[PDB]
Design a protein around this ligand. Structure first.
Ligand code: HXO
Ligand code: ZN
Length: 255
């Protein structure tokens, strides 16, 4: 198979005699196929930054050991080189402490895997508006990706109501340094949706939330150039193309 870096892919495997799915040491979790009792699914994601050229996954069965090859594609992502440099980029120490703490909290959540589905049907778009900056937009320094856009921004005037893309459990609901007012929702199976730069948060950590339900109001908080809704998905432990993923997810999970 082939996959573009920064994308997720749904793997399908036989349910019976299946013991484990591995990439090197890493176990990859599995969940039931919703429409076929003899199948299981797994999600495999490539990082945007520093992917490997190729991936060899092994699915161990009682009497059998099948292999799976996935080649990394580049995609046609938007790319802006920086040759000028002059780089330093370090802030005060209690600000770095904030950045460090919020980062380790977020990884604790993103590492984690709820082994049941908290979602309900297909994902929705968090609001009915257009994209003003797509996932994958990169900044280059020396043929290396310095940074990239880890979600997709929708046009939204400050105060634009924002709805939950799917059901789940709210895991974050506070102002953070880079993301500003942010809500992160656990949908199960290590799938997290993200809603950043909000002007107002309408949910509490731990709170169960249904697809469609209001989560807050759009805003301009955090590292942004103006008011917009930043929408991201994390799955397979990686930030992935939000709209692509929604599209792949709904193909399996409608009804
Ligand atoms: C630490 C970092 O990498 N920040 C990046 C991406 C970013 C945001 C949030 C997070 S999390 N889930 O708290 O670890 C990681 C990475 C970033 O500046 N995103 C800005 C807010 C954006 O998207 N503007 O439209
Ligand atoms: Zn964004």
């Amino acid at each position: 198979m082939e996959l573009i870096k920064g994308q997720a892919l749904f793997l399908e495997l036989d349910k019976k005699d299946f013991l484990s799915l591995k990439n090197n040491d890493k176990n990859i979790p599995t969940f039931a196929h919703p429409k076929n009792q003899e199948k299981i699914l797994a999600i495999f994601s490539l990082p945007y930054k520093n992917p490997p050229q190729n991936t060899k996954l092994i699915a161990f069965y009682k009497d059998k050991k099948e292999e799976i090859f996935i080649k990394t594609l580049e995609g046609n992502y938007k790319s802006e080189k920086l040759q000028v440099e002059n780089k330093k980029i370090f802030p005060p120490k209690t600000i770095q402490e904030r950045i460090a703490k919020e980062l380790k909290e977020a990884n604790a959540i993103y590492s984690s895997y709820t082994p049941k589905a908290l979602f309900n049907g297909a994902f929705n778009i968090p609001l009915n508006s257009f994209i003003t900056s797509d996932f994958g937009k990169a900044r280059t320094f020396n043929e290396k990706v310095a940074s990239y856009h880890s979600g997709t921004d929708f046009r939204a005037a400050t105060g634009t109501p924002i709805y939950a893309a799917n059901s789940g459990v709210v895991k974050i609901a506070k102002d953070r340094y880079f993301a500003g007012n942010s809500v992160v929702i656990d949908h199960g199976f290590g799938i997290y949706s993200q809603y950043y730069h909000l002007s107002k948060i309408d949910v509490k950590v731990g709170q169960k939330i249904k697809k469609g339900e209001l989560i807050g109001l759009s805003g301009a908080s955090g590292r942004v150039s103006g008011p917009a809704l930043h929408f991201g998905i994390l799955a397979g432990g990686k930030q992935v193309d939000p709209l692509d993923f929604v599209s792949k997810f709904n193909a399996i999970f409608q009804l």
